[PDB]
Motif scaffolding. Structure first.
Motif, PDB file in Angstrom:
ATOM      1  N   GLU A 114       0.851  -1.239   0.000  1.00  0.00           N
ATOM      2  CA  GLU A 114       0.000   0.000   0.000  1.00  0.00           C
ATOM      3  C   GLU A 114       0.861   1.254   0.000  1.00  0.00           C
ATOM      4  OE1 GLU A 114      -3.213  -0.252   3.000  1.00  0.00           O
ATOM      5  OE2 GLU A 114      -3.283  -2.452   2.758  1.00  0.00           O
ATOM      6  N   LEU A 115       2.138   1.239   0.267  1.00  0.00           N
ATOM      7  CA  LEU A 115       3.024   2.442   0.178  1.00  0.00           C
ATOM      8  C   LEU A 115       3.578   2.539  -1.246  1.00  0.00           C
ATOM      9  CD1 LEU A 115       4.764   4.698   1.357  1.00  0.00           C
ATOM     10  CD2 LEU A 115       6.513   3.018   2.015  1.00  0.00           C
ATOM     11  N   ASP A 116       3.421   3.698  -1.897  1.00  0.00           N
ATOM     12  CA  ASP A 116       4.096   3.918  -3.186  1.00  0.00           C
ATOM     13  C   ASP A 116       5.562   4.254  -2.928  1.00  0.00           C
ATOM     14  OD1 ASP A 116       5.046   5.378  -5.615  1.00  0.00           O
ATOM     15  OD2 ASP A 116       2.952   5.212  -6.253  1.00  0.00           O
ATOM     16  N   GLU A 117       6.479   3.556  -3.603  1.00  0.00           N
ATOM     17  CA  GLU A 117       7.943   3.729  -3.409  1.00  0.00           C
ATOM     18  C   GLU A 117       8.369   5.169  -3.756  1.00  0.00           C
ATOM     19  OE1 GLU A 117       9.775   0.675  -5.958  1.00  0.00           O
ATOM     20  OE2 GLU A 117       9.440   1.847  -7.767  1.00  0.00           O
ATOM     21  N   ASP A 118       7.675   5.836  -4.694  1.00  0.00           N
ATOM     22  CA  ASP A 118       8.030   7.242  -5.051  1.00  0.00           C
ATOM     23  C   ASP A 118       7.546   8.249  -3.984  1.00  0.00           C
ATOM     24  OD1 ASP A 118       9.416   6.428  -7.392  1.00  0.00           O
ATOM     25  OD2 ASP A 118       7.652   6.806  -8.603  1.00  0.00           O
ATOM     26  N   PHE A 119       6.460   7.918  -3.273  1.00  0.00           N
ATOM     27  CA  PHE A 119       5.993   8.725  -2.113  1.00  0.00           C
ATOM     28  C   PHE A 119       7.030   8.619  -0.980  1.00  0.00           C
ATOM     29  CE2 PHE A 119       3.900   9.507   1.892  1.00  0.00           C
ATOM     30  CZ  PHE A 119       3.225  10.662   1.652  1.00  0.00           C
ATOM     31  N   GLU A 120       7.514   7.423  -0.663  1.00  0.00           N
ATOM     32  CA  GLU A 120       8.558   7.310   0.367  1.00  0.00           C
ATOM     33  C   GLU A 120       9.840   8.067  -0.060  1.00  0.00           C
ATOM     34  OE1 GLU A 120       8.787   6.562   3.423  1.00  0.00           O
ATOM     35  OE2 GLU A 120      10.873   5.880   3.805  1.00  0.00           O
ATOM     36  N   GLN A 121      10.251   7.930  -1.346  1.00  0.00           N
ATOM     37  CA  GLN A 121      11.506   8.617  -1.785  1.00  0.00           C
ATOM     38  C   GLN A 121      11.363  10.138  -1.688  1.00  0.00           C
ATOM     39  OE1 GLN A 121      14.249   6.943  -2.585  1.00  0.00           O
ATOM     40  NE2 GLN A 121      15.351   8.943  -2.820  1.00  0.00           N
ATOM     41  N   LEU A 122      10.170  10.694  -1.987  1.00  0.00           N
ATOM     42  CA  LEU A 122       9.879  12.116  -1.811  1.00  0.00           C
ATOM     43  C   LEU A 122      10.065  12.511  -0.325  1.00  0.00           C
ATOM     44  CD1 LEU A 122       9.111  14.962  -2.791  1.00  0.00           C
ATOM     45  CD2 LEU A 122       6.682  14.216  -2.609  1.00  0.00           C
ATOM     46  N   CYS A 123       9.461  11.755   0.611  1.00  0.00           N
ATOM     47  CA  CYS A 123       9.598  12.090   2.058  1.00  0.00           C
ATOM     48  C   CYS A 123      11.103  12.062   2.427  1.00  0.00           C
ATOM     49  CB  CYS A 123       8.821  11.064   2.880  1.00  0.00           C
ATOM     50  SG  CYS A 123       7.023  11.146   2.799  1.00  0.00           S
ATOM     51  N   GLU A 124      11.863  11.088   1.954  1.00  0.00           N
ATOM     52  CA  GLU A 124      13.308  10.943   2.285  1.00  0.00           C
ATOM     53  C   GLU A 124      14.040  12.193   1.773  1.00  0.00           C
ATOM     54  OE1 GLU A 124      14.834   6.894   1.530  1.00  0.00           O
ATOM     55  OE2 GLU A 124      13.140   5.839   2.614  1.00  0.00           O
ATOM     56  N   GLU A 125      13.724  12.669   0.559  1.00  0.00           N
ATOM     57  CA  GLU A 125      14.457  13.829  -0.026  1.00  0.00           C
ATOM     58  C   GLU A 125      14.048  15.106   0.651  1.00  0.00           C
ATOM     59  OE1 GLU A 125      14.480  13.430  -4.470  1.00  0.00           O
ATOM     60  OE2 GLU A 125      15.539  11.477  -4.245  1.00  0.00           O
ATOM     61  N   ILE A 126      12.815  15.347   1.060  1.00  0.00           N
ATOM     62  CA  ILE A 126      12.461  16.540   1.853  1.00  0.00           C
ATOM     63  C   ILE A 126      13.243  16.441   3.197  1.00  0.00           C
ATOM     64  CG2 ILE A 126      10.673  17.907   2.945  1.00  0.00           C
ATOM     65  CD1 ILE A 126       8.669  16.429   0.950  1.00  0.00           C
ATOM     66  N   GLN A 127      13.189  15.309   3.919  1.00  0.00           N
ATOM     67  CA  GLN A 127      13.920  15.113   5.250  1.00  0.00           C
ATOM     68  C   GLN A 127      15.409  15.512   5.090  1.00  0.00           C
ATOM     69  OE1 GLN A 127      14.736  10.930   6.717  1.00  0.00           O
ATOM     70  NE2 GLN A 127      13.861  11.576   8.698  1.00  0.00           N
ATOM     71  N   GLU A 128      16.058  15.022   4.026  1.00  0.00           N
ATOM     72  CA  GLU A 128      17.521  15.191   3.773  1.00  0.00           C
ATOM     73  C   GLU A 128      17.857  16.642   3.409  1.00  0.00           C
ATOM     74  OE1 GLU A 128      21.511  15.004   3.333  1.00  0.00           O
ATOM     75  OE2 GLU A 128      20.243  13.432   4.195  1.00  0.00           O
ATOM     76  N   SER A 129      16.868  17.447   2.996  1.00  0.00           N
ATOM     77  CA  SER A 129      17.048  18.890   2.673  1.00  0.00           C
ATOM     78  C   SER A 129      16.933  19.791   3.901  1.00  0.00           C
ATOM     79  CB  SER A 129      16.040  19.342   1.644  1.00  0.00           C
ATOM     80  OG  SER A 129      14.764  19.558   2.266  1.00  0.00           O
ATOM     81  N   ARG A 130      16.486  19.282   5.050  1.00  0.00           N
ATOM     82  CA  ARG A 130      16.149  20.147   6.209  1.00  0.00           C
ATOM     83  C   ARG A 130      17.367  20.217   7.142  1.00  0.00           C
ATOM     84  NH1 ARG A 130       9.612  20.140   6.901  1.00  0.00           N
ATOM     85  NH2 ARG A 130       9.328  21.044   4.808  1.00  0.00           N
TER      86      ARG A 130
END
Ligand SMILES: COC(=O)[C@H](Cc1ccco1)c1ccncc1
Length: 130
Positions: A114-130
């Motif tokens: 039920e998790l889209d792999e591109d939705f998780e990668q988006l969350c990882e890239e916002i986290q890594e920018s902060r």
């Protein structure tokens, strides 16, 4: 950005839904609330970071999880705490261990479906920018 805050809001909605589905399963009642310090005073001498599904619900609402990877670290801690506290051959210890393994496996199988792999990668890239 507002778009990034909408991303994290969708992550919290997803994590609350997975957690509710685990918390209503009768097999996992033993993982729904803290181990009570009166009934089991030894618990907190052995287990240095207790974790349970009610604490996970509170953490989602405190914005502690920015990725599904950081949520799964707390599901893994519920399971590893039960394996280390109850390691013996008797039926009571073997039953909780089998339930702990089933809670971990069930959480990972709902996420894989039920998790889209591109939705998780988006969350990882916002986290890594902060
Ligand atoms: C998450 O809960 C536990 O690790 C307790 C340990 C515990 C409670 C009393 C003595 O030992 C447990 C509860 C129910 N069945 C097995 C073990």
């Amino acid at each position: 950005s507002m778009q990034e805050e909408d991303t994290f809001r969708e992550l919290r909605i997803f994590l609350r839904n997975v957690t509710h589905r685990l918390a209503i399963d009768k097999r996992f009642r033993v993982f729904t609330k803290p181990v009570d310090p009166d009934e089991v005073p030894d618990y907190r001498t052995v287990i240095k970071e207790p974790m349970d599904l009610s604490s996970v619900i509170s953490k989602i609402d405190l914005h502690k999880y920015l990725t599904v990877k950081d949520y799964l670290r707390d599901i893994d801690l519920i399971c590893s705490n039960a394996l280390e506290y109850n390691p013996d051959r008797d039926p009571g210890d073997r039953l909780i261990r089998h339930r702990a393994c089933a809670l971990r496996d069930t959480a990972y199988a709902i996420i894989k479906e039920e998790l889209d792999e591109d939705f998780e990668q988006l969350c990882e890239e916002i986290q890594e920018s902060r």
